[PDB]
């Protein structure tokens, strides 16, 4: 069991709110992160969210997935993970001075492909893959999570934006989102940055008129990565590849 | 459940075998290590060891403990973990040119104290803590395990008692060397072993290196005449680390501190600077 008794965890600095609950830095046999429902009387929806989140985190033991360590129910609903030193891939690419060699951009893509390949193998659909949810622990190891701290529409597949079918999230919607991460790495830019109304992107991507401008990839982006990227961004859901095939293509091409 | 179906794991280069199986580099959703029992006809003792090892690894989720990922039963008994890039603390200190600043030696000791404090909180006794079992993943994060490769061969054809002699004896507490108790391993035997790791970090040397009769070390440590020479600690070893070291190396089992107290001391020690 992964339930942590009461009176063991210390809660330190409040980092931010996210998904459901607030994240804190904390102390429990070393540094930890603590996501805590800051509500006196939880609703059933809140309780169920917490159980669903623990339910999935429990199933993960992989170096590229944020390390779940346990949970607590009293005094508040709380999920405990490893603390990560550094900042998100989003921060490095679009909020900072930082410079990546093409070797490291390929490696980030590969570590991300491993973690996503692992999740999909255990029937877990992320639903919100994006560079802000890819953490660079010690600026060296990718850690996938849902860190919380609008936003997500750039990584939304057409079918997801449209919302035609009850809950449109699929392995392939995750694949599309990974495609958009590859765009970020190989261009250094968020897609649709030439278009200035958020409402148009939503209409045009869902309509199928707008997709990322693949001309803006770098001169030294390998040609196979470019082809892959475009295989992931296919507008029809079922033309997209699977992560075993994606992982194999990025590990083949990174050998060279 | 953490059972991995057959025909998913790929086994690559053989890293080393010892008494509890053979470790390989492997592929399963990325790099992994694979400990595989390379025995034609396992005994009940061997089968039970495998179940006990999985049993305890299953209970661990902590950044300073080697990450268990799963196990397989067919075609062979196998435990799967994260692959670690780098080399053991033993390699860096006694088999290498590497130089650690005192900041990093204190940090290695602290990360090791966190992992051990975590294990003891879940009632897990390591039994074989030593610098060869403390891995420096990416030369930055301590990962405690039992890596312990005794030969480089496809299996270990010695006794466990030879294996311990070639390695483990320096980190054995007096009570453990004697074997006067029925099963002499305790939280405190682990504490003694951590004491000897602190000696390694703060001296850069294995203890008793001014002696070569391995048989004498066994008699004299167990007899209580010989303990590590604390004079050989560095000029810039903080005085509180030295005092802690000696509290861990107490010859009487129950005079030794507990890991909550050890960790609290090392985090205060590190606070200063
Ligand atoms: C405390 C905590 C708690 C939870 C999570 C987290 O990552 N949770 C989480 C949530 C979802 C999913 C995947 N989607 C499943 C969707 N399901 C339906 C909706 O409800 C959830 C289940 C995944 C997965 F699978 F991607 F791993 C992970 C992260 C943290 C964290 C931190 C952390 C560590 N150092 C730092 C530094 C700064 C900020 N923070 N920080
Ligand atoms: C594949 C594998 C499998 C298992 C273990 C492992 O470390 N297993 C293991 C064994 C013992 C103990 C602690 N002993 C107390 C509990 N025990 C239960 C059974 O009865 C009493 C003993 C612990 C613990 F708790 F410390 F984690 C862990 C390590 C590996 C490995 C590798 C590995 C990863 N990259 C590298 C690189 C080079 C060499 N290798 N390599």
Author numbering:
A (entry chain A): 449 to 597, 614 to 720
B (entry chain B): 449 to 721
The paper states:
The RAS–RAF–MEK–ERK signaling pathway (ERK signaling) regulates mammalian cell growth, proliferation, and survival. Activated RAF proteins subsequently initiate a cascade of phosphorylation and activation steps of downstream kinases MEK1/2 and ERK1/2, which then phosphorylate an array of proteins leading to specific cellular effects. BRAF mutants are found in up to 9% of all human cancers and over 50% of melanoma.
Using this approach, we generated PHI1, which uses a morpholine-based head group predicted to interact proximal to the BP-IV site. To investigate the structural basis of BRAF inhibition by PHI1, we determined the co-crystal structure of PHI1 with BRAFV600E at 2.65 Å resolution. Comparison of BRAFV600E-Ponatinib and BRAFV600E–PHI1 structures demonstrated a major allosteric rearrangement induced by PHI1 binding promoting an inward shift of αC-helix. This PHI1-induced BRAF conformational change is compatible with kinase domain dimerization, as a BRAF dimer with two PHI1-bound protomers is found in the BRAFV600E–PHI1 crystal structure. Interestingly, this PHI1-dependent allosteric modulation stabilizes the αC-helix in a tilted αC-CENTER conformation, distinct from αC-ΙΝ or αC-OUT conformations but closer to αC-IN, which we termed αC-ΙΝ* (αC-INstar). In contrast, PHI1 positions the morpholino-based head group between the HRD motif and αC-helix, having van der Waals contacts with HRD residue R575 and residues N500 and V504 of αC-helix that result in additional 38 A2 of buried solvent-accessible surface area. In addition, the specific hydrogen bond between the nitrogen of ethyl-amino linker of PHI1 and the main-chain carbonyl oxygen of H574 is maintained. Our data demonstrate that PHI1 has a very weak inhibition for the BRAFV600E monomers compared to the BRAFV600E dimers, suggesting that interactions with the αC-allosteric site (BP-VI) are favored in the dimer conformation while are unfavorable in the monomer conformation.
